[PDB]
Design a protein around this ligand. Sequence first.
Ligand SMILES: [Mg+2]
Ligand SMILES: [Mg+2]
Ligand SMILES: [Mg+2]
Ligand SMILES: [Mg+2]
Ligand SMILES: [Mg+2]
Ligand SMILES: [Mg+2]
Ligand SMILES: [Mg+2]
Ligand SMILES: [Mg+2]
Ligand SMILES: [Mg+2]
Ligand SMILES: [Mg+2]
Ligand SMILES: [Mg+2]
Ligand SMILES: [Mg+2]
Ligand SMILES: [Mg+2]
Ligand SMILES: [Mg+2]
Ligand SMILES: [Mg+2]
Ligand SMILES: [Mg+2]
Ligand SMILES: [Mg+2]
Ligand SMILES: [Mg+2]
Ligand SMILES: [Mg+2]
Ligand SMILES: [Mg+2]
Ligand SMILES: [Mg+2]
Ligand SMILES: [Mg+2]
Ligand SMILES: [Mg+2]
Lengths: 70, 117, 154
Amino acid sequence: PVIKVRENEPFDVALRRFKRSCEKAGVLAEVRRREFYEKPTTERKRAKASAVKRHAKKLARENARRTRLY
Amino acid sequence: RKQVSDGVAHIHASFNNTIVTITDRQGNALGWATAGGSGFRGSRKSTPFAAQVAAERCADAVKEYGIKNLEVMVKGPGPGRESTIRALNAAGFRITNITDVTPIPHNGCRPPKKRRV
Amino acid sequence: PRRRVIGQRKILPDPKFGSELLAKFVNILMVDGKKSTAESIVYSALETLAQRSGKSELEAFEVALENVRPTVEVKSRRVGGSTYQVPVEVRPVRRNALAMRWIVEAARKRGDKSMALRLANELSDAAENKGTAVKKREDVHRMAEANKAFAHYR
RNA sequence: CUUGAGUCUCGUAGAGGGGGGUAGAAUUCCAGGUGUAGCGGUGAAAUGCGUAGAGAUCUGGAGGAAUACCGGUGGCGAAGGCGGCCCCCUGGACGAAGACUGACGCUCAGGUGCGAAAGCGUGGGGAGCAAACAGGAUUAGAUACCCUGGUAGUCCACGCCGUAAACGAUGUCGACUUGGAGGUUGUGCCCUUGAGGCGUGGCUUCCGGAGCUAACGCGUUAAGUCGACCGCCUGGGGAGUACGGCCGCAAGGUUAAAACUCAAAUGAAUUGACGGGGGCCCGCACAAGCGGUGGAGCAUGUGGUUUAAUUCGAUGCAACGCGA
Ligand SMILES: [Mg+2]
Ligand SMILES: [Mg+2]
Ligand SMILES: [Mg+2]
Ligand SMILES: [Mg+2]
Ligand SMILES: [Mg+2]
Ligand SMILES: [Mg+2]
Ligand SMILES: [Mg+2]
Ligand SMILES: [Mg+2]
Ligand SMILES: [Mg+2]
Ligand SMILES: [Mg+2]
Ligand SMILES: [Mg+2]
Ligand SMILES: [Mg+2]
Ligand SMILES: [Mg+2]
Ligand SMILES: [Mg+2]
Ligand SMILES: [Mg+2]
Ligand SMILES: [Mg+2]
Ligand SMILES: [Mg+2]
Ligand SMILES: [Mg+2]
Ligand SMILES: [Mg+2]
Ligand SMILES: [Mg+2]
Ligand SMILES: [Mg+2]
Ligand SMILES: [Mg+2]
Ligand SMILES: [Mg+2]
């Protein structure tokens, strides 16, 4: 996440760009995940859970949440 | 005794501690400071505020060298990662470039085992 | 409470000087619902203080308060299972109340004979900034400074 | 005879397998520069490392292992499994049109092969991690969880072992039976007018009808309707154990009982209760405050002890100035 502060760019603005760049890159997330060894089985299981939850939630929202709530 | 005007601020921001190190553009270190040496231990040195005061201390230390421009290289996942740069700017350097140099492997060495807490 | 933003209650101003702050001080001082006695003590203390230090009763009293109010106190935020002492800026009504409370406690402690005498001495000390209530404020501030790392991470 | 089964022609996608090179990032170590008192770690510490100059930072070098992003309920494989890039050898699947053989097929007890990880033998290698082990914490203890270290092992070659919740807890092969939304990979036509319209194959994910099921659920990839063959079960424990056999260097694997003992053991779902589950909410529940009790004397009640009797009852909150 390289940033160079442009001419007449405020510092706060520069900081904002830097943070955005880092978030987009996903550096913190990568480091956190690589902090400890996740077993392959654990990684697979987590992936499966994420996929299932995401799919179920999407289905519930779009199709199940098409009714009169009140 | 020497003057350089333009330095690099290497902000090593681990979870436990923040190390700030001002250096010449080549790599040679001028002054450093940590939250530990800044007077914070444990829960207090693992905070953004501690990082900020460490940064202030570092700036004071390298005041002899008369550094005016400064590019900051942030490393690691840390509570500071922002406080240090804010503090440095307040201490009054022109921040020119801000770069992240956190070392991610390309699936290399095995990490240590997961903590059971 | 859980579900209450109750209205602050009405305190009448003291008859001699017409001051709400002074009335509150008298209330804090009072014990056993004996208001008359408390007001007599407060007035005696004020009169002595005015004579000793200067200008008026209310101005002297204010000066003492200024030297004994705390800007910041600490609370114990208990979120991560352990308790962090966090600093917090003390709002004005609390600042006055806390300062008054500290002053009265210090006066009660103090070794002079009459209550009025103790109060007058304590107030004068506060004005100078070498007394015990002031010491208490200093201690509170010292703690806040120590725990400044936990200020805006509650 | 050609519809099952196979052969040939042309393409397609693929972490399918075996061998050999190579790339960059990162960790470790080594040497050197800068530089100075801390670093590391945790809930908090300490062990550990550092003024014999560490950690930080730049340069160079060594070496091992693994391939970020792409990356996907994506793909390939009989399963186990397979993930940087390049080459060499190599197996299968699928589609298109035809041509060919002419039931050549399905299943399979014994048998044979393949078979994660750990483990074993011999010879290498060894960065990181890490059983064992050591020290520091925590604790009533802590032969654990946490921390700092750390050896087998993890890697390579070649042998062995032969097991896993080796799971879809679902044997293989074939036929038939309403649908919807996707993914992936072919292919025919439509002007691809654009990413696009209508088909037709393969594999694949979810939802759901009839039907089935104890229910949960399955539902054209069946747990539906059927046919062929195999494997396996017959209450819980004893026990996948003993003995015998076979196999193995060993660890052990495989085959596999009996006495004795009980009247249950189990599956799914229901209503509660409970959770050091989750969401929302209240109450002097905490918080903010004020005043007490626990120390003293005395009053009173209780326990106890004493007594001839110390009447009987109340005795976690919700008995103890209570019946009185
Ligand atoms: Mg660790
Ligand atoms: Mg391939
Ligand atoms: Mg295939
Ligand atoms: Mg067999
Ligand atoms: Mg192995
Ligand atoms: Mg070996
Ligand atoms: Mg060996
Ligand atoms: Mg280790
Ligand atoms: Mg360990
Ligand atoms: Mg088995
Ligand atoms: Mg498996
Ligand atoms: Mg089985
Ligand atoms: Mg077969
Ligand atoms: Mg279904
Ligand atoms: Mg029996
Ligand atoms: Mg056996
Ligand atoms: Mg045997
Ligand atoms: Mg309270
Ligand atoms: Mg008492
Ligand atoms: Mg007593
Ligand atoms: Mg009692
Ligand atoms: Mg009785
Ligand atoms: Mg009784």
